[PDB]
Structure formats: structure tokens, C-alpha cells
């Protein structure tokens with residue numbers, strides 16, 4: 658599965674290779690550092706919204722484990738031989754990120770629907786359609802990147818299908834946001850709209866990294882992809898979770914929950 662990604666096609670200078678290593682290991686620290694934050698502030702969240710901060714904790718560990726896994730796979734697969742790091746074993750692939758997205762994405766959507774104050778039949782119903790839409794997006798995206806070396810044509814086609822799901826997923830999310838923001842407390846009706854636009858931006862970096870094989874097929878394209886993934890992870894998971902947390906607390910305060918009001 659690794660011989661199918663462009664990471665296996667190139668040698669890397671010590672600078673390119675250590676930069677990629679430091680990106681992944683930094684992501685681990687950021688994610689686990691934020692996990693502690695979400696764990697601490699959970700006590701300041703009303704039971705109605707407390708599940709939202711817990712799903713962030715799940716996202717943080719899910720991300721940190723796979724970034725940690727990627728970092729160790731990166732240093733196992735390459736060895737500095739004759740002035741460059743060269744592939745040794747076949748143990749590094751990006752497919753492990755797509756497995757991470759399969760898990761974290763439902764949690765990210767869930768935490769959104771919860772602070773939107775959906776409940777009951779609508780929560781279950783809206784969650785089912787979004788998760789299925791997201792899984793169709795992720796799965797077709799995973800199949801396309803298997804061809805990122807061999808058949809760029811198939812990458813583009815599977816990329817097109819994946820984007821169809823992505824567009825439908827966003828129209829559902831946005832529609833639920835704009836039709837349910839008048840229900841949000843403490844002024845969080847204004848914050849949620851900005852969260853939606855934070856999503857649009859952060860999530861759109863992924864398909865751009867997905868296309869790096871097609872417009873920058875060299876060792877600097879590999880660095881660029883990881884840099885885009887790192888920016889995207891931090892905004893779609895950390896910053897997004899922080900703002901979800903703030904909305905969960907603000908509404909808890911406006912709802913009379915004392916620990917939130919005292920914070």
C-alpha cells in the first residue's frame with residue numbers, strides 16, 4: 658500500500674526528511690496538549706453539551722495516535738545513506754490518515770449537531786446521512802489515492818466522486834446551521850456561522866493535498882502535502898474543537914449551569 662504513494666518514489670535530503678519528521682511529532686504534541694485542555698474544561702460544561710467536549714478528547718487521541726504512528730513509520734522506512742535518506746522498508750503510507758478520518762469525522766460532525774441543540778429523531782436522522790455522506794467521501798478518496806502513482810486518471814475520477822459527497826455533506830451541514838442558529842444561546846448564533854466557515858476552509862485543504870501528486874510530483878510536493886495536512890488537522894480538529902468548546906460553555910452559562918457561569 659506504500660509503494661502506491663509518491664513518498665516511495667524519491668530520496669529526501671536531511672532537511673526535507675527532518676522537517677517532515679518534526680511536523681508529525683509536533684502534531685502529536687499539539688493534539689495531546691489540547692486533549693488535556695478539553696479534559697479539564699469538561700467540568701465547566703452542562704450535561705446537555707458535555708458530550709461535545711468528550712468527542713474532542715476522542716478526536717485528539719485518535720489524531721495523535723496516527724500522527725505518532727506516522728512519525729515512527731517515517732523513521733523506520735528510511736535510512737541516511739550517502740548524503741540522502743533512502744527508502745528501506747515498506748511501512749509508510751498515507752492510507753492511515755484516511756482511516757483516521759473515518760473515525761474523527763463522525764465525531765467532529767456529532768459535536769456540531771449537539772451544540773446546534775438538535776435532539777431525538779432529528780439528531781439520529783441528520784447524523785446518519787452526514788456520516789454516510791462522509792464515509793462515501795472518505796472511501797472513494799482512499800481508492801483514488803491508491804492510484805496517485807500509477808493512474809492519475811483514476812485519482813481524478815475517484816476524486817470527482819468523492820467531491821460529490823463532500824458537496825452534499827456541506828449542504829446538509831450548512832442548511833442545519835442556518836435553520837437552527839436562532840435556537841442558540843448566549844450569542845452563539847453568531848459564533849456558529851463562523852464555525853461553518855472555519856469548516857469550509859480547513860476541510861478544503863485536504864482535497865488540495867490530495868492533488869499534490871498531480872501538480873507537484875517531486876520530493877518538495879511530499880513536504881508540501883504534509884504541511885497542508887498539518888495546517889488542515891490543526892484547524893479542523895484543534896481550533897474547531899476549541900470553538901465548539903466555547904459555544905458549549907457559553908450556552909451552558911446562558912442555561913443556568915453555575916460552573917460555566919463562574920468561568
Ligand SMILES: CCCCCCCC/C=C\CCCCCCCC(=O)OC[C@H](O)CO
Nearest residue numbers: 779782783784786787821822825829832833
Ligand atoms: C451509478 C453508480 C452508483 C452511484 C451512486 C452514488 C450517487 C449518489 C450520490 C449522492 C446522492 C446523495 C443524496 C442522498 C442524500 C439525501 C438525503 C439527505 O441528505 O437528507 C438530509 C436531511 O437534511 C436530514 O434530515
Ligand SMILES: CCCCCCCC/C=C\CCCCCCCC(=O)OC[C@H](O)CO
Nearest residue numbers: 816817820821824827828829831832835836
Ligand atoms: C467534481 C465535480 C463536482 C463539482 C461541482 C460542485 C458544485 C459546487 C456548488 C455548490 C457548493 C455547495 C457548498 C455548500 C454550502 C452550503 C450552503 C447552504 O447550505 O445553503 C444555505 C441554506 O440552504 C439556507 O437554509
Ligand SMILES: *C\C=C(C)/C=C/C=C(C)/C=C/C1=C(C)CCCC1(C)C
Nearest residue numbers: 798816819820823860863864867893
Ligand atoms: C481531520 C478532519 C477532517 C474533516 C478531514 C476531512 C477530509 C476531507 C474533507 C477530504 C476530502 C476529499 C475530497 C473532497 C475529494 C478528494 C479526496 C479527499 C477525501 C481528500
Ligand SMILES: CCCCCCCC/C=C\CCCCCCCC(=O)O
Nearest residue numbers: 705706708771780781784785788789
Ligand atoms: C450508518 C452509520 C451509523 C451512524 C449513526 C449515527 C448515530 C448517532 C446517534 C445519536 C447521537 C447521540 C449523541 C450522544 C448523546 C448526546 C445527546 C445529548 O445528551 O444531548
Ligand SMILES: CCCCCCCC/C=C\CCCCCCCC(=O)O
Nearest residue numbers: 759789790791792793794796797800
Ligand atoms: C466500516 C463501514 C464502512 C461503511 C460502509 C457503508 C457506507 C459506504 C458508503 C459508500 C460506499 C462507496 C463505494 C466504495 C466501494 C467501491 C470501491 C472499490 O472498488 O472497492
Ligand SMILES: CCCCCCCC/C=C\CCCCCCCC(=O)O
Nearest residue numbers: 809810813814816817820864867868
Ligand atoms: C479532488 C478534486 C476533485 C475534482 C477533480 C477534477 C477532475 C478533473 C477533470 C479532468 C480533466 C481531464 C483529465 C486529463 C487526463 C489526465 C489523466 C491522464 O493523464 O491519463
